Design a protein around this ligand. Structure first.
Ligand SMILES: *Cc1ccc(C(=O)N2CCC[C@@H](O)C2)cc1
Ligand SMILES: *Cc1ccc(C(=O)N2CCC[C@@H](O)C2)cc1
Ligand SMILES: [Ca+2]
Ligand SMILES: [Ca+2]
Ligand SMILES: [Cl-]
Ligand SMILES: [Cl-]
Ligand SMILES: [Cl-]
Ligand SMILES: [Cl-]
Lengths: 9, 229, 229, 9
């Protein structure tokens, strides 16, 4: 189950 | 720690650290920027979020490796001790982020896009605390996550279109909260389905670039539904 | 810092940290193990080497990103300042490793396999210092790297078979030193070719598992030769 | 130009 990856910005 | 550095230099160095994949530095620079006391712009909020998500993401991955080894051995004290050390470090990072949100990002956030963003953050970092929680407070930590997510949901439904990427990512993560933390898989599936369908019906209003942003997160909802059903 | 923890617990936790990809922790645990004062076994030497190679590898990658940005801008002080911060942190890690080798790993290392291993390490961490060096000491740092590699080469040629993986990896890295640091590409190419050919001629003596270990490093020599010729 | 990767053991 994936949350928002949110690791690139 | 960053008190003597200019706010704009902190922001510039957070961007550099992101390029260098130095996420611990990135988070310290963004912590310093928040502590300057000014509100954060949209871009700055994303820098804050990306930095701590990477830091705690590495801690969570390590904790899961060590928890798995620890469980295999319960079928010396070193594996438990080291899992505890990593767990304590993770909790400290979550507490630091929650402290920034509470002092004073959330209370100064008046626009829907900032307020929903910070409350989603609050739900996420209590969710990370809940992942490692066992004792007297696992239930209170879970309810703190739920309450933050719920307030963010209520605002996002009133103030944002169904395709807004922050609204979609909030619903994605709240559905993961339901599935993984709250033992409510039916609520997780219902939320992800309703979120996906209401976004689909709003896509016709979007530009080409907004369409790309929204459909990317819709695919993440669909990936979860495929895994859950 | 690790003075109160048992040596065997430090070693066990270094292995756990490797599994958790927590290389900073791994290096601190192995630093503590070295500081217990006992010699290191073959496996323990590898743990020490893997830990610091990962730590300094991340620092080198970040330094190169930041150096590249800095050079583009020279065609505020933030990029230079942040590159300097990363550079200082890298130099401190290299100095820490070199300090462990000097106090007192190298002087207590009597067997060829340990002595060559530590001297190769010494050459590698001076090479990393040379990569970022500019001023009064770049030449002395380069000669320190050369001298360590050379002593290791002399021992490995006398005491180890041409297929020994430590002998092959030493020659690989000394050839990279020649190519990248010493501005001697012909010496780099000659060393890699002679190392490869003398290993090839010794492969017939090896077991299936030793053959795999040796041919893997021989392929790295060949990859470099392909890039250099 | 690759040195020993040396990152896994
Ligand atoms: C929590 C969260 C949700 C969505 C995103 C995202 O993909 N974007 C892209 C374009 C607009 C940005 O504000 C956010 C990130 C985090
Ligand atoms: C510097 C260096 C050279 C070679 C290796 C390596 O591949 N091995 C595998 C089997 C024997 C080990 O001692 C070393 C690692 C580092
Ligand atoms: Ca100022
Ligand atoms: Ca003891
Ligand atoms: Cl520990
Ligand atoms: Cl405000
Ligand atoms: Cl800096
Ligand atoms: Cl000895």
């Amino acid at each position: 189950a994936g949350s928002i990856p949110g690791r690139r910005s | 720690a960053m008190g003597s550095m200019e706010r704009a230099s902190l922001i510039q160095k957070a961007k550099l650290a992101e390029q260098a994949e130095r996420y611990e530095d990135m988070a310290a620079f963004m912590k310093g920027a928040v502590e300057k006391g000014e509100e954060l712009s949209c871009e700055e909020r994303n820098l804050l979020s990306v930095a701590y998500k990477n830091v705690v993401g590495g801690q969570r991955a390590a904790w899961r490796v060590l928890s798995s080894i620890e469980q295999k051995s319960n079928e010396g004290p070193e594996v438990r001790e080291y899992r505890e050390k990593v767990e304590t470090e993770l909790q400290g990072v979550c507490d630091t982020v929650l402290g920034l949100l509470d002092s004073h990002l959330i209370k100064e956030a008046g626009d829907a896009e900032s307020r929903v963003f910070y409350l989603k953050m609050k739900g996420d970092y209590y969710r990370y605390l809940a992942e490692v929680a066992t004792g007297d407070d696992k239930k209170r930590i879970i309810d703190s996550a739920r309450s933050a997510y719920q307030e963010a949901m209520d605002i996002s439904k009133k103030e944002m279109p169904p395709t807004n990427p922050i609204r979609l990512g909030l619903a994605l993560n709240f559905s993961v909260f339901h599935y993984e933390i709250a033992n409510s898989p039916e609520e997780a599936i219902s939320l992800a389905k309703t979120t996906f369908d209401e976004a689909m019906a709003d896509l016709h209003t979007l530009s080409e670039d907004s369409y790309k942003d929204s459909t990317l997160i819709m695919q993440l909802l669909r990936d979860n539904l495929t895994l859950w059903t």
